[PDB]
DNA sequence: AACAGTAGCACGCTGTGTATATAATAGTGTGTTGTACAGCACAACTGCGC
């Protein structure tokens, strides 16, 4: 082994207590997006950390893009710092993780097919819909998507050890179905 | 007759469908409910006439 999974999204929610004028939103800001017949939100993003954040006339707000928990808290900081300074009367609250997306390689070729008839009731996979097997973790709850070269995509968890535990869990699996 | 330029065709490369998680929230679609409108031979009935 020696593989730890590298993260490569956060997403997140925050809520800023009050009610927000969109179009004064994308107005204001300096780097928005805004149009009510595609999507209801003001796309906000900002250069450091490179994140992307959808902002809702409730006042609640999703925070995406970012690689690290750290940044995420850092990023959403900042977002709700640039809706006070546009005028409302906004408040960094519940910030919470609510998914993180990993992945690495094995550096060896998997027998989908194989992994598939033997994991069964926890494997999907149809080729000629996706060409990676979508392998349902039960504990931790995650899901992996397999793919044939060796690259692994982990996803569905709300803390950074379950996507270390899936992978731990999972390797030995590989290896039983690797091709050289 | 030869050379240069322009147009057309073919090939290669880049971008967007499929799949995973996860939050946000008002809309859109579907289903259900309510209201309104549109071959014998003999056996029995029944029907007609006295």
Do not use: W
């Not at 929610?13 to 800001?29: F, N, P, S, Y």
């Not at 997006?33 to 450091?48: D, G, H, L, Q």
């Not at 709700?80 to 993180?100: L, M, S």
């Amino acid at each position: 082994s020696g593989i730890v999974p590298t993260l490569q999204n956060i997403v997140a929610t925050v809520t800023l207590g009050c009610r927000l004028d969109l179009k004064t939103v994308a107005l204001h800001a300096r780097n928005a997006e805004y149009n009510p017949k595609r999507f209801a939100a003001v796309i906000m993003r900002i250069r450091e950390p490179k994140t992307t954040a959808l902002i809702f006339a409730s006042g609640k707000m999703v925070v995406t893009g970012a690689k690290s928990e750290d940044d995420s808290k850092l990023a959403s900081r900042k977002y709700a710092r640039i809706i006070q300074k546009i005028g409302f009367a906004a408040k960094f609250t519940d910030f919470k993780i609510q998914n993180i997306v990993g992945s690495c390689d094995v550096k060896f070729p998997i027998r989908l097919e194989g992994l598939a008839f033997s994991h069964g009731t926890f494997s999907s996979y149809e080729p000629e819909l996706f060409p990676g097997l979508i392998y349902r973790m039960v504990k931790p709850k995650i899901v992996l998507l397999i793919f044939v070269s060796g690259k692994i995509v982990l996803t569905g968890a709300k803390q950074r050890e379950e996507i270390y535990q899936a992978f731990e869990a999972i390797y030995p699996v590989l290896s039983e179905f690797r091709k050289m």
